[PDB]
Design an enzyme around this catalytic site. Structure first.
Site, PDB file in Angstrom:
ATOM      1  CB  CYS A 226     -30.146 -49.605  32.082  1.00 22.04           C
ATOM      2  SG  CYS A 226     -31.539 -48.989  31.094  1.00 22.04           S
TER       3      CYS A 226
ATOM      4  NE  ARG B 120     -30.769 -48.406  36.132  1.00 22.48           N
ATOM      5  CZ  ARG B 120     -29.941 -48.525  37.155  1.00 22.48           C
ATOM      6  NH1 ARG B 120     -30.210 -49.416  38.087  1.00 22.48           N
ATOM      7  NH2 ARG B 120     -28.846 -47.777  37.236  1.00 22.48           N
TER       8      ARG B 120
ATOM      9  CD1 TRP C 259     -36.192 -43.901  24.172  1.00 22.96           C
ATOM     10  CD2 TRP C 259     -38.092 -45.013  24.609  1.00 22.96           C
ATOM     11  NE1 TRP C 259     -36.680 -43.443  25.369  1.00 22.96           N
ATOM     12  CE2 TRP C 259     -37.848 -44.106  25.656  1.00 22.96           C
ATOM     13  CE3 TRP C 259     -39.235 -45.817  24.663  1.00 22.96           C
ATOM     14  CZ2 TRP C 259     -38.711 -43.981  26.746  1.00 22.96           C
ATOM     15  CZ3 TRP C 259     -40.083 -45.696  25.733  1.00 22.96           C
ATOM     16  CH2 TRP C 259     -39.825 -44.780  26.761  1.00 22.96           C
TER      17      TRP C 259
ATOM     18  CD  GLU D  35     -28.489 -46.811  23.023  1.00 30.52           C
ATOM     19  OE1 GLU D  35     -28.238 -48.033  23.129  1.00 30.52           O
ATOM     20  OE2 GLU D  35     -29.639 -46.325  23.200  1.00 30.52           O
TER      21      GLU D  35
HETATM   22  C1  HEM Z   1     -36.680 -47.199  27.108  1.00 32.79           C
HETATM   23  C2  HEM Z   1     -35.553 -46.564  26.768  1.00 32.79           C
HETATM   24  C3  HEM Z   1     -34.161 -47.105  27.158  1.00 32.79           C
HETATM   25  C4  HEM Z   1     -33.032 -46.393  27.028  1.00 32.79           C
HETATM   26  C5  HEM Z   1     -32.894 -44.946  26.500  1.00 32.79           C
HETATM   27  C6  HEM Z   1     -31.939 -47.221  27.490  1.00 32.79           C
HETATM   28  C7  HEM Z   1     -30.622 -46.836  27.492  1.00 32.79           C
HETATM   29  C8  HEM Z   1     -29.565 -47.674  27.708  1.00 32.79           C
HETATM   30  C9  HEM Z   1     -28.201 -47.413  27.313  1.00 32.79           C
HETATM   31  C10 HEM Z   1     -27.721 -46.147  26.565  1.00 32.79           C
HETATM   32  C11 HEM Z   1     -27.453 -48.439  27.720  1.00 32.79           C
HETATM   33  C12 HEM Z   1     -25.933 -48.552  27.487  1.00 32.79           C
HETATM   34  C13 HEM Z   1     -25.705 -49.721  26.538  1.00 32.79           C
HETATM   35  C14 HEM Z   1     -24.686 -49.426  25.474  1.00 32.79           C
HETATM   36  O1  HEM Z   1     -24.266 -48.251  25.319  1.00 32.79           O
HETATM   37  O2  HEM Z   1     -24.303 -50.393  24.773  1.00 32.79           O
HETATM   38  C15 HEM Z   1     -28.329 -49.404  28.387  1.00 32.79           C
HETATM   39  C16 HEM Z   1     -27.987 -50.611  28.974  1.00 32.79           C
HETATM   40  C17 HEM Z   1     -28.846 -51.600  29.435  1.00 32.79           C
HETATM   41  N1  HEM Z   1     -30.245 -51.591  29.395  1.00 32.79           N
HETATM   42 FE1  HEM Z   1     -31.352 -49.873  28.926  1.00 32.79          FE
HETATM   43  N2  HEM Z   1     -32.436 -48.460  27.888  1.00 32.79           N
HETATM   44  C18 HEM Z   1     -33.810 -48.434  27.691  1.00 32.79           C
HETATM   45  C19 HEM Z   1     -34.652 -49.513  27.948  1.00 32.79           C
HETATM   46  C20 HEM Z   1     -34.288 -50.727  28.507  1.00 32.79           C
HETATM   47  C21 HEM Z   1     -35.185 -51.847  28.770  1.00 32.79           C
HETATM   48  C22 HEM Z   1     -36.697 -51.912  28.424  1.00 32.79           C
HETATM   49  C23 HEM Z   1     -34.469 -52.821  29.337  1.00 32.79           C
HETATM   50  C24 HEM Z   1     -34.943 -54.206  29.835  1.00 32.79           C
HETATM   51  C25 HEM Z   1     -36.212 -54.523  30.145  1.00 32.79           C
HETATM   52  C26 HEM Z   1     -33.100 -52.352  29.457  1.00 32.79           C
HETATM   53  C27 HEM Z   1     -32.081 -53.075  30.020  1.00 32.79           C
HETATM   54  C28 HEM Z   1     -30.761 -52.767  29.933  1.00 32.79           C
HETATM   55  C29 HEM Z   1     -29.688 -53.624  30.375  1.00 32.79           C
HETATM   56  C30 HEM Z   1     -29.771 -55.023  31.043  1.00 32.79           C
HETATM   57  C31 HEM Z   1     -28.422 -52.840  30.053  1.00 32.79           C
HETATM   58  C32 HEM Z   1     -26.986 -53.321  30.340  1.00 32.79           C
HETATM   59  C33 HEM Z   1     -26.500 -53.875  29.014  1.00 32.79           C
HETATM   60  C34 HEM Z   1     -25.181 -54.551  29.200  1.00 32.79           C
HETATM   61  O3  HEM Z   1     -24.661 -54.642  30.363  1.00 32.79           O
HETATM   62  O4  HEM Z   1     -24.643 -55.010  28.147  1.00 32.79           O
HETATM   63  N3  HEM Z   1     -33.006 -51.068  28.941  1.00 32.79           N
HETATM   64  N4  HEM Z   1     -29.612 -48.889  28.362  1.00 32.79           N
HETATM   65  C1  LIG Z   2     -19.393 -56.883  24.834  1.00 31.25           C
HETATM   66  N1  LIG Z   2     -20.583 -56.576  25.621  1.00 31.25           N
HETATM   67  C2  LIG Z   2     -20.636 -57.075  26.989  1.00 31.25           C
HETATM   68  C3  LIG Z   2     -21.629 -55.805  25.052  1.00 31.25           C
HETATM   69  C4  LIG Z   2     -21.590 -54.410  25.109  1.00 31.25           C
HETATM   70  C5  LIG Z   2     -22.602 -53.632  24.540  1.00 31.25           C
HETATM   71  C6  LIG Z   2     -23.673 -54.237  23.892  1.00 31.25           C
HETATM   72  C7  LIG Z   2     -24.759 -53.378  23.271  1.00 31.25           C
HETATM   73  N2  LIG Z   2     -26.082 -53.616  23.880  1.00 31.25           N
HETATM   74  C8  LIG Z   2     -26.187 -52.877  25.152  1.00 31.25           C
HETATM   75  C9  LIG Z   2     -27.618 -52.413  25.361  1.00 31.25           C
HETATM   76  C10 LIG Z   2     -28.489 -53.153  26.158  1.00 31.25           C
HETATM   77  C11 LIG Z   2     -29.804 -52.733  26.354  1.00 31.25           C
HETATM   78  C12 LIG Z   2     -30.259 -51.565  25.756  1.00 31.25           C
HETATM   79  C13 LIG Z   2     -31.573 -51.142  25.943  1.00 31.25           C
HETATM   80  C14 LIG Z   2     -31.996 -49.971  25.312  1.00 31.25           C
HETATM   81  C15 LIG Z   2     -31.102 -49.234  24.530  1.00 31.25           C
HETATM   82  N3  LIG Z   2     -31.493 -48.068  23.928  1.00 31.25           N
HETATM   83  N4  LIG Z   2     -29.833 -49.680  24.367  1.00 31.25           N
HETATM   84  C16 LIG Z   2     -29.394 -50.819  24.959  1.00 31.25           C
HETATM   85  C17 LIG Z   2     -28.076 -51.242  24.759  1.00 31.25           C
HETATM   86  C18 LIG Z   2     -23.713 -55.629  23.812  1.00 31.25           C
HETATM   87  C19 LIG Z   2     -22.702 -56.405  24.389  1.00 31.25           C
END
Ligand code: HEM
Ligand SMILES: CN(C)c1ccc(CNCc2ccc3ccc(N)nc3c2)cc1
Ligand code: HEM
Ligand SMILES: CN(C)c1ccc(CNCc2ccc3ccc(N)nc3c2)cc1
Ligand SMILES: C[C@H](O)[C@H](O)[C@H]1CNc2nc(N)[nH]c(=O)c2N1
Ligand SMILES: C[C@H](O)[C@H](O)[C@H]1CNc2nc(N)[nH]c(=O)c2N1
Ligand SMILES: [Zn+2]
Lengths: 407, 411
Positions: B108, B111, B280, B285
């Site tokens: 993420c 963070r 947000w 994305e």
């Molecule tokens: C507040 C603005 C936030 C932004 C801009 C942000 C941004 C991102 C982005 C760009 C990714 C890559 C996921 C993708 O491209 O599919 C990601 C992953 C992730 N985010 Fe954040 N996020 C935010 C908030 C949060 C919050 C509030 C949480 C949880 C409380 C969170 C938990 C996670 C987790 C667990 C992943 C890994 C997802 C995965 O492995 O599939 N994020 N985040």
């Molecule tokens: C197949 N695989 C494992 C997979 C890969 C990508 C996804 C897409 N969600 C990832 C994600 C998590 C948390 C987020 C929080 C905030 C944000 N702005 N964006 C977030 C995006 C789902 C599943």
């Protein structure tokens, strides 16, 4: 033990077994992945030779042949006696092609078997090295129709008689530190540009000065040689739109020729093995031009495009980054110099992966490096799971010579 | 054992000690790196040390390590585990746990915001209708008329694994995808399977290009139920370009609230299988992945045609060109409508600062380069040049199998 990689764009799954023949280490553990870190005796020697000869004889369908068995004892005897051994030309060529084939960070490996190998193991002096290097450059450049090549200088003996090419690439632009504070030319080579001066070079203190070669033969002091300009193909950079682009005064060389790596074959170490292929467009336009610690022309270009640079949100950098790269490719193609765009190269690599998985059982690949530095997710490799592991023969990094050299 | 990461743009070197506190495995070994692999019923036996490790963490953070409050709590949890075979977290612990799972999320980039997280405790929830209510409140709170606020809603933890709460949707708000008989796709191709389930479950699909999917909610291991998020709670943004007037006519819009709902939240060995959370959007994305992935809306061509690019050679970089303009549009539309969004430059830059802060205050920051680096313009963001160490800390968010694949149907 048998591993699956999935492509998430196409659902195609491949099964990897090749990794089971990996002998070197990754840097990663079960507790920590180091995937994005840039840099992680006769006793030793004989199993290494054996492993290699085993690969080699397997590759020509003579595994467990008399030729095989015989070569094995022959090398074993020579090791016992001389505490090293010499590769047959066929083995040398096989080894070099396979170091390329195994280079997990190289997107260009679909070409791996077409490598021209120049055997320079008879070389004794820096002048000899220069001669061999000029010949390499001229052959590979081929008037713009580039051909991959490697030139292999004598192997390490006791590490006190090393052959080393001190430059990082055969052809690079000088960088000097200014009084204005900043840096004229290429910042990556400021230190090397200094060491050339420290050994006697006459810098034309310009912006795009082709650096001299600094050649070390047999563990001696390195010597300066100027590559004949007629051998250094260069490409003036113009945009097929921005007629102002040319006045930035940018050019780049056509031949990327990495000269500071170590080729390992069957335990033998070739500390001087300059090799070359051709450029992927983004290497010059994204990295060389737009990196902050490099030529860093983004702002300047953006000015000339009269973009809104007031906020990051206008994506002005992105917009310019594309145009610059359009120009690089444009310039090269117009001048008939071999170049490949990141879309074609990545498309080719996916095809190469398919082939390797099919005919070899896999293809070690470093996603962090295979994915281009722009437009990553619109190239097929972004969605391609890859497995990274170290196979031998291999190209290895090695310490800069000035740190080691007992003058 | 200390470990150094280097930023190759700034030569700033950092020292990680935090990785020592890592328990979970990465997938990698001494002989293979799985760094680019996408996705590489618990007894009282293994539960207590997990509770103890959590509680030690928690009481350290509040500077009460070894206090009597610490010791009694450990005792209380111990008794409750051996008596009931599980335990309940105090509100304080729940909040701390949710925040840290976010903080530990190595993939993420957002963070820097981790400590500002609104935790909604939905552990008293018992039915799907109850779940819908909580979720509506989340969406309304989190949306805040466009001034987005991060939040997580936490439903009851797993017990015997036969009474799970699950949100079947991958995100609370997403568009339907419909496979046509001619093989084409209408709407978002990513959600075709899920759309079919909904339809089979009795959803009447309007079958348009941007239909907000219904919620499919499972309480206490029961069969899931359909609910429609009130439209007035679903903030959407029509996509236009600040210079190209034809862009509006492409008919695109997107929703403002990214709210991932299919992850599993782990705290002190307890498993929270329904914990939808939201922050947000980083612009790419939507602008890169959602619109331009070949396996998504895939509008690169149509955009490219309308800008009149040389689409004859890839070498013209027409794809790259259209990609940037689309991302310009997404950012432009959101900011114009005052809906919180962040560009990839701003987000990555903030992450580098967060990371450095984390190395100093915490001894490290686990980070997944493959995921941290944005899907366009990689090397002109500072993260590209940043060495990162990836390792797993708890509390954490984990993937879990899609529930349609595991659910025991009651009928
Ligand atoms: C507040 C603005 C936030 C932004 C801009 C942000 C941004 C991102 C982005 C760009 C990714 C890559 C996921 C993708 O491209 O599919 C990601 C992953 C992730 N985010 Fe954040 N996020 C935010 C908030 C949060 C919050 C509030 C949480 C949880 C409380 C969170 C938990 C996670 C987790 C667990 C992943 C890994 C997802 C995965 O492995 O599939 N994020 N985040
Ligand atoms: C197949 N695989 C494992 C997979 C890969 C990508 C996804 C897409 N969600 C990832 C994600 C998590 C948390 C987020 C929080 C905030 C944000 N702005 N964006 C977030 C995006 C789902 C599943
Ligand atoms: C012929 C066309 C070729 C293309 C398009 C190509 C492309 C690339 C690119 C883009 C990289 C990433 C490096 C960077 O970004 O700095 C790379 C790395 C590399 N290439 Fe290739 N290359 C070609 C030929 C060759 C040849 C002929 C060799 C050796 C005989 C080779 C060996 C390597 C090695 C060893 C690395 C990574 C070094 C490391 O471990 O960090 N390449 N290549
Ligand atoms: C670790 N470190 C300080 C470091 C890292 C990278 C480099 C740059 N050489 C990478 C390379 C190798 C072979 C190539 C072959 C063909 C081509 N078109 N391009 C190639 C690019 C220098 C030093
Ligand atoms: C195979 C590969 O790991 C996979 O496509 C990853 C790459 N990096 C990513 N990075 C982000 N932010 N989101 C993703 O979905 C992915 N996909
Ligand atoms: C820190 C990170 O490993 C570093 O910036 C890497 C990332 N990926 C790369 N990829 C390529 N092709 N070339 C590079 O120099 C790098 N640098
Ligand atoms: Zn790894």
């Amino acid at each position: 033990r048998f591993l699956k990689v999935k492509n998430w764009e196409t659902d195609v799954v491949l099964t990897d077994t090749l990794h089971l023949k990996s002998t070197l280490e990754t840097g990663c553990t079960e507790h920590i992945c180091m995937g994005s870190i840039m840099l992680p005796t006769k006793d030793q020697l004989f199993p290494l030779a054996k492993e290699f000869l085993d690969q080699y004889y397997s590759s020509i369908k003579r595994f467990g042949s008399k030729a095989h068995m015989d070569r094995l004892e022959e090398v074993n005897k020579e090791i016992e006696s001389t505490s090293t051994y010499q590769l047959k030309d066929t083995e040398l060529i096989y080894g070099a092609k396979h170091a390329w084939r195994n280079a997990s960070r190289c997107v260009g490996r679909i070409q791996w078997s077409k490598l021209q190998v120049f055997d320079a193991r008879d070389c004794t002096t820096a002048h000899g090295m220069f001669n061999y290097i000029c010949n390499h450059v001229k052959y590979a450049t081929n008037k713009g129709n580039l051909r991959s090549a490697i030139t292999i200088f004598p192997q390490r003996t006791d590490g006190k008689h090393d052959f080393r090419v001190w430059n990082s690439q055969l052809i690079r632009y000088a960088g000097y530190k200014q009084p204005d504070g900043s840096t004229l030319g290429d910042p990556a080579n400021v230190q090397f540009t200094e060491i050339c001066i420290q050994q006697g070079w006459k810098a034309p203190r310009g912006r795009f000065d082709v650096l001299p070669l600094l050649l070390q033969a047999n563990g001696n002091d390195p010597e300066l040689f100027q590559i004949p300009p007629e051998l250094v193909l260069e490409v003036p950079i113009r945009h097929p739109k921005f007629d102002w682009f040319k006045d930035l005064g940018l050019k780049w060389y056509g031949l990327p020729a990495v000269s500071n790596m170590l080729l390992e074959i069957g335990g033998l170490e070739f500390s001087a093995c300059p090799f070359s292929g051709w450029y992927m467009g983004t290497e010059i336009g994204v990295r060389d031009y737009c990196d902050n610690s490099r030529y860093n022309i983004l702002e300047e270009v953006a000015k000339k495009m009269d973009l809104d640079m007031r906020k990051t949100s206008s994506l002005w950098k992105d917009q310019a980054l594309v145009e610059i790269n359009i120009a690089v490719l444009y310039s090269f193609q117009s001048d008939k110099v071999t170049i490949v765009d990141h879309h074609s190269a990545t498309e080719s690599f996916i095809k190469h992966m398919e082939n390797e998985y099919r005919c070899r059982g896999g293809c070690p690949a470093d996603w962090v490096w295979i994915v281009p530095p722009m437009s990553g997710s619109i190239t097929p490799v972004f969605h391609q799971e890859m497995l990274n592991y170290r196979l031998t023969p291999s190209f290895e990094y090695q310490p800069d010579p000035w740190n080691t050299h007992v003058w």
